[PDB]
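2024-03-11 09:14:02 INFO queue: dequeued item Transglutaminase-like domain-containing protein, len=361
2024-03-11 09:14:02 INFO validating residues
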Amino acid sequence: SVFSLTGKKRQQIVKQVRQRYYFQQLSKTEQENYLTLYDSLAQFREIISLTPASKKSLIKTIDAFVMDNPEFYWITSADYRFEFSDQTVFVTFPIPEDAKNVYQDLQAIGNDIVANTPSKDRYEQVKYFYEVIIRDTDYNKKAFEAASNQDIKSVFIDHLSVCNGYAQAFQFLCQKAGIPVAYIRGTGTSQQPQQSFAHAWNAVQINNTYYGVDVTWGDPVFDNHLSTINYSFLCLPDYLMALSHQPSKDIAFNTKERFENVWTIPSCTDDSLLYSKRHQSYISTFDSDAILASLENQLLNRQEPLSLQFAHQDDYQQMVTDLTTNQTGYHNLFNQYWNNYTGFTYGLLPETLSISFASRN
Ligand code: NA
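2024-03-11 09:14:37 INFO prediction written
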């Protein structure tokens, strides 16, 4: 095809996209068009000429490209618009007038964040990116409770964003760091009160296995039940993430239609990177002794607030019931370590089977 990349430019683009997530699920012709899309958007073209395929194949290619490539911030929330003509498919992404300088503004910010990570351990880098986005970005709760908040410009330029921007910003940084990463879209479900909502989050590959990451839900303005940085959404297995997340495999390419069950979602099975597990606050079996010992170990390290995360729903629920009835074990322990003790308060985040404790005032 005349639109396929060639020469040195092709080599450069092949290297650039090799780790992109949805790219891996595209066929040969679709990957060629993906490469052409990358080159043309990197030249800041509004209209891209692609080689003809079925309507579905083109939508798959475009959808994969948009999810995979936050750097082209102007495409992240755009409609999928294309037209067939004379053995060519013309794809249009309206492009802002300042797109080149904003694109390079974001490159400089991203490069600075990645280059100065304190550790080069991949987990520590992922944790650092989580922290950076949460600390430096205001969550736009007014917007949620109701575009322009959906891309990495809203995160790194405006510092005011919603889940789609957070998740694309996390991918943006991971890509620059060379960490395989995915953007995942779907449905979040919160409790107290029960509620479902459109949502976006991430997966990362560390040590050749995937881990779930939800930066947005770790933001205290998004959810303050444990209030701060809520680490209980950092590198989760699916048996915990699935309690509040349902990823979508579908492509809704307009308001009336979709393609069902197109994409494969990363499988996250390892719990070894849980913050709670790494800090000896993960309870995998209901046991009063083990619960109090974990809290006492935290108290011996002079931590406040204390925290617990459970592996299994019914164990978390039994702990909740014991806190509404048998509280004596807890007062006896806390009174030993907290001065002027007059009780304790607790916060519940059932979405990750988590609880936090603090001295009452
Ligand atoms: Na924030």
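2024-03-11 09:14:37 INFO annotate: The two ends are 72 Å apart (CA to CA).
2024-03-11 09:14:38 INFO item closed
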